[PDB]
């Protein structure tokens, strides 16, 4: 806990103003037109910034892993209506990007329809948590939720962050600061290098939402952002929460705010870093060649 | 741990009389003691447990008693199926360090018999490989107490002889002993006289059998 | 009837681990404790140690203290014992013994198994050599014929004469561990001197681990 | 490692019969405690819960047995007991007796025939690790006094006080702009406590000169005259 | 390196017919192959080089062919001066690792001939030196395929016997085998019966010759 301090730390943070790989995996057409469901296998390095937007159930699952054929431990983080199904059991990994099927939102079947379960094998550890990570019932009527999950992998424990913030009607990506508090810090032993997501339609299907903010079948908001080591200056409020931060490596003004240890820089010249040119080429194959062979008189 | 030691270690009696084998300790084990019976060729069986009561499947001839630091078994009548090795074990309450002793063999008291001394030269098939082993036979004698002497050209040899003693036979209550002196081919061809001296209690004079190569 | 079935013979190598099981029968493997005791050839019981059928609450001995693990299994009601780093002094016969009391208390050992000859040495093909006495070795009108087998580490051989037809006067000496690490014994039989040259005596040697059968005539 | 809790209701005059080394009619042919019982004989009176104005056909004593029972033995069989030379393959005759009988606990009976619930805590003392946890124990809370604090790993000393700061429910510790623990969280009551440095300072001896006199005065810089004449 | 292996390893045919000996490999050696011919008592000569053309000083009866990974020699007519051992060698371009195979012997087939079994006891002059050699003679028989058994007092002997097989004679196309059992001086006086068992294809029953000392 810190109160009214300008603390600077070095950790795997998301760099400000970066390229977020947005994959609009939507499947909706009023004229029965052919459409594609996106599901790319993105490499997992230094973390991820999964931040989706749904109404009742669009994305439920954050299965990590390197090679999901026969030699990768499962990392299911599925959070259905019953409880959390976090499990690291090793088994025959499936390649199906869809949990059961994108259609068939009827509640006559199983609550989650675990069709990805191919064959169970010897397990290593399990974690059944009562507090679910997705808390939303759509009681508002026309507003969705904005959740973000920073899934970073450390040599010790596995960190998971989340925060709920209003995502009321806007035009572009929400430009607003929001601090992310950790929820679970379960240990991990598998060195994941790639990442995969799951999408399915839950049995709790609501009324037909003909409007854009209604039926969210073709409304996937699957975002992904890679982390990297970068210094960040954090300012804590009187309540102990973070109100804003700086990048410390994005703009020259950010480096001045980082060095002076203050978000307000006065009028003046401030020395921040030291410029240095790196060697472009490299001389190798040491000099002082030997004699030349008598290639003459032959040609 | 309490070093369970047995003083007699050899109870040679006759079938029909009474036997008293003792196994003393140091700590107060008046109520912490167990008695077993290990027969040659199978697993040990429970003879008397808790040293105060009788075990299950045990005849009435086995009677155990004792208190303090001196215990003994009071067998009513010895039987041919009773000659075996007995042990003792205490049951500590907190520290589970159950130890044992050495064992007491129950022998049979037959008549005094002289050991049949025989000597065997090494076979030709064994000399074909370059080794020589002289076998000296000692059968039909008392429990193993005599030592075998090997004299090669009036010189005593030691360290290169191996002895093998059989169990007590159920027919005549006798034993068998075989001494094998392992020597090389060159050392065997170098010497000529090889003798086996036997000095047993039943023999009034040491019997020495020798042969000429 | 309560009978504890164990394994048979098992050979290993210095610096390894041997897995020996002892399955229970007759009684429910939920209330009676079990002990694993070692019986050395010529020596007696050496080490204690109890295994809990319910949980993994075990208690190893003080001599080993770490180089032994005793697991439990309620599925098939079978215990296990894995001794690590077997040396030249651990070759003995292991037994599994039960107790007369329940889980809390423990008095002594009542129900025992059958044994498991665990030995640590490389095996080698046996070789039979006869033992014929000299002409001056006939004392008291009797003669002894024998056969000296060598180069065999295990000792399952039952040296019978004339395919078991000759049993009187047959003495089978225990095997002696030589300096090379291989056991060897002799089996002699006392026969009258009048039968020399008229009756044929053949010692039968059979070694099951090596599947070697050599009939040696004396 | 693992404690076995065995509960059973017996008569009111056999509370001391179940003891290590005791030959009782309900201690020999029933649950017996051996001479190595390292537990307790914890019991209480149940003349209000197990009492009922009826025939009390729920409890028994199990006296009729062929042989003595081993310690910690639970006999589930209901075979007909045979005293001697009178086999009863069907119903129990005159010499044959049933091994069960109603234990009448009348509410009007005084001490000696009341239902007493006795539960022994058989402590298995097998030399084995204490399963999953060993110590993990906390004490009480002393405040307004410079003492040594060991709140979940944090060691040191200082005057533990009360702070009017609301920590977020994921943060345990607390620091300042000087990398010094200035606030902790009670791991028991989940309250916010302020850890302040222990009162120290510097002693200054005021001397008017040894040539003049020898009376001196001490000055404790940074003390409110509370942490130790005018 | 390419392990040149020959499957037949023994080409037993009659002089006058055609012969086909194969020497396969793994790598593509269609244009990299050489054929030799080693006669007993001299140096190996070049038979066919490059596996596609004929060598110098080679008669027209030798014809070689093959391509890919399966090669064979096509001899027109066998001659008495052609019975020898042939080899194969590939010529790698970059790595100079010219290897060879095992060789195939070309022998003559006359008829099923029974081996003449003879046994020789050790002489008295050799016994004075401390050694004894029992020689068992086996002559006038097919190429070496039978094994010699030594029975001393109805006991099988192994490891102490040495066998010597001669080359194929150019007169009668027969072979000779001599088994010499190396014994010592004391190894011959104790034992009396020495037998040499011969079990050959040309013999309907094992012929055993023994003598009494």
DSSP letter string over chain C?
A: ----EE--EEEE-SS-EEEEEEE--SS-TTT--EEEEEE-SSS-B----EE-SSSS--B--TTTSSSEE----TTTTEEEEEEES--TT--EEEEEEE-SS-SS-------B---EEEEES-----EEEEE---TT--BTTEEEEEEEEEEESS-----EETTTTB-TTEEEPPPEE-TTS-EEEEEEEEEEGGGTTTS--EEEEEETTTTEEEEEE-
SS3 state of residue E186 = helix
How far out from the chain centre does Cα B80 lie?
A: 17
Nearest CA in chain B to E182: B128
Phi/psi for E35 (5° steps) reads -125, 130
Q: Which structure tokens are listed for D72?
A: 């910690």
Q: Do C4 and C98 touch, CB atoms closer than 8 A?
A: yes
Q: Do A73 and A63 touch, CB atoms closer than 8 A?
A: no
* DSSP one-letter code for D80: P
CA–CA gap between residue C217 and residue B38 (Å, rounded): 38
Q: Do A10 and A248 touch, CB atoms closer than 8 A?
A: no
Alpha helices, DSSP H, located in chain B? 124-127, 185-190
- The strand pair at E175-184 and E161-165 is best described as antiparallel
Q: Do A15 and A249 touch, CB atoms closer than 8 A?
A: yes
Solved using: cryo-EM
Q: Do E10 and E22 touch, CB atoms closer than 8 A?
A: no
Nearest CA in chain B to D67: B56
For residue B119, the cross-strand partners are: B136
C133-154 CB burial, b ≥16 within 10 A, e <16: beeebebeeebbbbbbbbbbbb
Q: Do A86 and A126 touch, CB atoms closer than 8 A?
A: yes
Please, after which residues is chain D broken with C–N above 2.5 Å?
228
Could you tell me the end-to-end alpha-carbon distance of chain C, in angstroms, rounded to an integer?
48
B137-154 CB burial, b ≥16 within 10 A, e <16: bbbbbbbeebebbbebee
CA–CA gap between residue E112 and residue B134 (Å, rounded): 50
CA–CA gap between residue B133 and residue C127 (Å, rounded): 14
Sign of CA dihedral B72, B78, B82, B84: positive
- The strand pair at C116-120 and C9-12 is best described as parallel
Contacts of D37 by beta carbon, 8 Å cutoff, 6+ apart: C104, C105, D20, D120, D122
SS3 state of residue A256 = helix
For residue D121, the cross-strand partners are: D5
SS3 state of residue E80 = helix
Q: Determine, for residues A5 and D177 on separate chains, whether the beta-carbon distance falls below 8 Å.
A: yes
Q: Which structure tokens are listed for E78?
A: 């066998």
CA–CA gap between residue B178 and residue B162 (Å, rounded): 8
Helices and strands in chain D: count of H runs, count of E runs: 0, 9
Nearest of C78, C77, C60 to residue C69 by alpha carbon? C60
Looking at chain D, which subunits does it touch, using at least 3 CB pairs closer than 8 Å as the criterion? A, B, C
Q: Which structure tokens are listed for B141?
A: 């004698």
* DSSP one-letter code for A199: B
Dihedral (Cα; A174, A176, A181, A182), 10-degree rounding: 40
**Element (DSSP H or E) covering residue A254:** helix A252-259
Looking at chain E, which subunits does it touch, using at least 3 CB pairs closer than 8 Å as the criterion? B, C
CA–CA gap between residue D11 and residue C213 (Å, rounded): 73
How far D117 CA sits from the closest chain C CA (Å)? 21
Q: Do C116 and C93 touch, CB atoms closer than 8 A?
A: yes
Nearest CA in chain E to C216: E155
**Element (DSSP H or E) covering residue C49:** none
How far out from the chain centre does Cα E165 lie?
A: 8
Q: Which structure tokens are listed for E89?
A: 């060698």
CA–CA gap between residue C31 and residue B67 (Å, rounded): 31
- The strand pair at B131-141 and B147-152 is best described as unpaired
Q: Do D26 and D10 touch, CB atoms closer than 8 A?
A: yes
CA–CA gap between residue D157 and residue D150 (Å, rounded): 9
* Number of neighbouring beta carbons within 10 Å of residue E193: 14
Partners of B28 on chain D (C-beta within 8 Å) are none
Nearest of C130, C131, C104, C11 to residue C50 by alpha carbon? C104
Helices and strands in chain C: count of H runs, count of E runs: 0, 17
SS3 state of residue D116 = strand
CA–CA gap between residue D58 and residue D103 (Å, rounded): 7
CA–CA gap between residue E28 and residue E71 (Å, rounded): 12
CA–CA gap between residue B88 and residue B72 (Å, rounded): 10
Nearest of A185, A61, A81, A163 to residue A130 by alpha carbon? A81
Partners of D171 on chain A (C-beta within 8 Å) are 1, 240
SS3 state of residue A187 = strand
**Cα angle for residues E142, E143, E148 (degrees, 5° grid):** 90
E68-102 CB burial, b ≥16 within 10 A, e <16: eeebebebeebeeebbbbbbbbbeeeeeeeeeebe
Q: Determine, for residues A241 and D168 on separate chains, whether the beta-carbon distance falls below 8 Å.
A: yes
CA–CA gap between residue C206 and residue E117 (Å, rounded): 33
Q: Which structure tokens are listed for E148?
A: 């010699």
CA–CA gap between residue B169 and residue D166 (Å, rounded): 91
For residue A53, the cross-strand partners are: none
| DSSP helix, strand, coil percent of chain B (3-state; round to 5) | 5, 45, 50
SS3 state of residue A258 = helix
Nearest CA in chain A to D174: A1
Q: Do B182 and C148 touch, CB atoms closer than 8 A?
A: no
CA–CA gap between residue D154 and residue D163 (Å, rounded): 18
How far B192 CA sits from the closest chain E CA (Å)? 12
Nearest of D50, B206, C38 to residue C48 by alpha carbon? C38
Contacts of D140 by beta carbon, 8 Å cutoff, 6+ apart: none
Regarding chains C and D, contact by 3 or more CB pairs under 8 A is answered as yes
| Number of inter-chain CB pairs under 8 A, B vs E | 27
Q: Determine, for residues B128 and E183 on separate chains, whether the beta-carbon distance falls below 8 Å.
A: yes
The length of chain D in residues reads: 230
Q: Do A16 and A237 touch, CB atoms closer than 8 A?
A: no
Residues of chain E contacting B, Cβ within 8 Å: 130, 152, 155, 157, 159-160, 183-184, 186-188, 190-191
Which of D4, D37, D127 is closest, CB to CB, to C59?
Answer: D127
Q: Do D161 and D169 touch, CB atoms closer than 8 A?
A: no
CA distances (Å), B138 to each of B105, B198, B204, in order? 21, 8, 16
Q: Which structure tokens are listed for A196?
A: 């995969």
Alpha helices, DSSP H, located in chain E? 124-127, 186-189
Burial of A219 (0-12, 13-18, 19+ CB in 10 A): buried
How far C9 CA sits from the closest chain D CA (Å)? 31
How far B120 CA sits from the closest chain E CA (Å)? 12
Q: Determine, for residues B126 and C174 on separate chains, whether the beta-carbon distance falls below 8 Å.
A: no
Partners of D35 on chain B (C-beta within 8 Å) are 31
CA–CA gap between residue C204 and residue C162 (Å, rounded): 7
Q: Determine, for residues B94 and D125 on separate chains, whether the beta-carbon distance falls below 8 Å.
A: yes
Dihedral (Cα; C160, C161, C166, C172), 10-degree rounding: -50
Contacts of E59 by beta carbon, 8 Å cutoff, 6+ apart: none
Q: Determine, for residues C44 and B85 on separate chains, whether the beta-carbon distance falls below 8 Å.
A: yes
Q: Do A68 and A94 touch, CB atoms closer than 8 A?
A: yes
Q: Do B134 and B121 touch, CB atoms closer than 8 A?
A: yes
């Amino acid at each position: 806990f810190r109160s009214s301090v300008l603390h600077s730390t070095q950790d795997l943070f998301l760099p400000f103003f970066s390229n977020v790989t947005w994959f609009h995996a939507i499947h909706v057409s009023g004229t029965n037109g052919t459409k594609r469901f996106d599901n790319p296998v993105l490499p997992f390095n230094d973390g991820v910034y999964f931040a989706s937007t749904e109404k009742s159930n669009i994305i439920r699952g954050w299965i990590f892993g390197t090679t999901l054929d026969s030699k990768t431990q499962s990392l299911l983080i599925v959070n259905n209506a019953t409880n959390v199904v976090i499990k690291v059991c090793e088994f025959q990994f499936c390649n199906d990007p869809f949990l059961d099927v994108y259609q068939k939102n009827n509640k006559s079947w199983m609550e989650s329809e675990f069709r990805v379960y191919s064959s169970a094998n010897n397990c290593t550890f399990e974690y059944v948590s009562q507090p679910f990570l997705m808390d939303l019932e759509g009681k508002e009527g026309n507003f969705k939720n904005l959740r973000e999950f920073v899934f970073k992998n450390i040599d010790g424990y596995f960190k998971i962050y989340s925060k709920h913030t209003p995502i009321n009607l806007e035009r572009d990506l929400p430009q607003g600061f929001s601090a992310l508090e950790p929820l679970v810090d379960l240990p991990i032993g598998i060195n994941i290098t790639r990442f995969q997501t799951l999408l399915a339609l839950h049995r709790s299907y609501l009324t037909p939402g003909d409007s854009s903010s209604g039926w969210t079948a073709g409304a996937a908001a699957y975002y992904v952002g890679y982390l990297q080591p970068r210094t960040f200056l954090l300012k804590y409020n009187e309540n102990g929460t973070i109100t804003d931060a700086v990048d410390c490596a994005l703009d020259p003004l950010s480096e001045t705010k980082c060095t002076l240890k203050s978000f307000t820089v006065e009028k003046g010249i401030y020395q921040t870093s030291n410029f240095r040119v790196q060697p472009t080429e490299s001389i190798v194959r040491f000099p002082n060649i030997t004699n030349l062979c008598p290639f003459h008189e032959v040609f | 741990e309490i070093v369970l030691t047995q003083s007699p270690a050899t109870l040679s009696l006759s079938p029909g009389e009474r036997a008293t084998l003792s196994c003393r300790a140091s700590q107060s084990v008046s109520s912490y003691l167990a008695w077993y019976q290990q027969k040659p060729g199978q697993a040990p069986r429970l003879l008397i447990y808790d040293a105060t009561n009788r075990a299950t499947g045990i005849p009435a001839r086995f009677s155990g008693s004792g208190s303090g630091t001196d215990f003994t078994l009071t067998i009513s009548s010895l039987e041919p199926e009773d000659f075996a090795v007995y042990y003792c074990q205490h049951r500590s309450n907190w520290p589970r360090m159950f130890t044992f002793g050495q064992g007491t063999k129950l022998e049979i008291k037959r008549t005094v018999a002289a050991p049949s001394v025989f000597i065997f030269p090494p076979s030709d098939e064994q000399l074909k490989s370059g080794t020589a082993s002289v076998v000296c036979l000692l059968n039909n004698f008392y429990p193993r107490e005599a030592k075998v002497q090997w004299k090669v050209d009036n010189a005593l040899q030691s360290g290169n002889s191996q002895e093998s003693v059989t169990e007590q036979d159920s027919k005549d209550s006798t034993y068998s002993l075989s001494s094998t002196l392992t020597l090389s081919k060159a050392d065997y061809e170098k010497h000529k006289v090889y003798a086996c001296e036997v000095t047993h209690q039943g023999l009034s004079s040491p019997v020495t059998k020798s042969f000429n190569r | 009837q309560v009978q504890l079935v164990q394994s048979g013979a098992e050979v290993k190598k210095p610096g390894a681990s041997v897995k020996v099981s002892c399955k229970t029968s007759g009684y429910t493997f939920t209330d009676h404790y079990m002990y694993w005791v070692r019986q050395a050839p010529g020596q007696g019981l050496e080490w204690m140690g109890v295994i809990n059928p319910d949980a993994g609450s075990v208690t190893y001995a003080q001599k080993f203290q770490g180089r032994v693990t005793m697991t439990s299994d309620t599925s098939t009601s079978t215990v296990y014992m894995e001794l690590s780093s077997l040396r030249s002094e651990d070759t003995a016969v292991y037994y599994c013994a039960r107790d007369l009391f329940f889980i809390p208390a423990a008095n002594s050992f009542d129900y025992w198994g059958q044994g498991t000859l665990v030995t640590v040495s490389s095996t080698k093909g046996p070789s039979v050599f006869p033992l014929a006495p000299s002409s001056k070795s006939t004392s008291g009108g009797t003669a002894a014929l024998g056969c000296l087998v060598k180069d065999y580490f295990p000792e399952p051989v039952t040296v019978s004469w004339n395919s078991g037809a000759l049993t009187s006067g047959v003495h089978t000496f225990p095997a002696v561990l030589q300096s090379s690490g291989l056991y060897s014994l002799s089996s002699v039989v006392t026969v009258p001197s009048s039968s020399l040259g008229t009756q044929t005596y053949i010692c039968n040697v059979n070694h099951k681990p090596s599947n070697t059968k050599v009939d040696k005539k004396v | 490692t693992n404690v076995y809790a065995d509960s059973f209701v017996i008569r009111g005059n056999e509370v001391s019969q179940i003891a290590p080394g005791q030959t009782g009619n309900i201690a020999d042919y029933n649950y017996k405690l051996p001479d190595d019982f390292t537990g307790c004989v914890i019991a209480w009176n149940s003349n209000k819960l197990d009492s009922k104005p009826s025939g009390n056909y729920n409890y028994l004593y199990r006296l009729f047995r062929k042989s003595k029972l081993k310690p910690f033995e639970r006999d589930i069989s209901t075979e007909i007991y045979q005293a001697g030379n009178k086999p009863c393959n069907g119903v129990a005759g005159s010499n044959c007796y049933s091994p069960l009988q109603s234990y009448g606990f009348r509410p009007t009976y005084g001490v000696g025939h009341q239902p007493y619930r006795v539960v022994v805590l058989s402590f298995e003392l097998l030399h084995a690790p204490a399963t999953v946890c060993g110590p993990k124990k906390s004490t009480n809370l002393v405040k307004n006094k410079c003492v040594n604090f060991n709140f979940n790993g944090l060691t040191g000393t200082g005057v533990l006080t009360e702070s009017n700061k609301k920590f977020l429910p994921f943060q345990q510790f607390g620091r300042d702009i000087a990398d010094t623990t200035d606030a902790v969280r009670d791991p028991q009551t989940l309250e916010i406590l302020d850890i302040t440095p222990c009162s120290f300072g510097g002693v200054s001896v005021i001397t008017p000169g040894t040539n003049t006199s020898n009376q001196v005065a001490v000055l404790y810089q940074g003390v409110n005259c509370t942490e130790v004449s005018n």
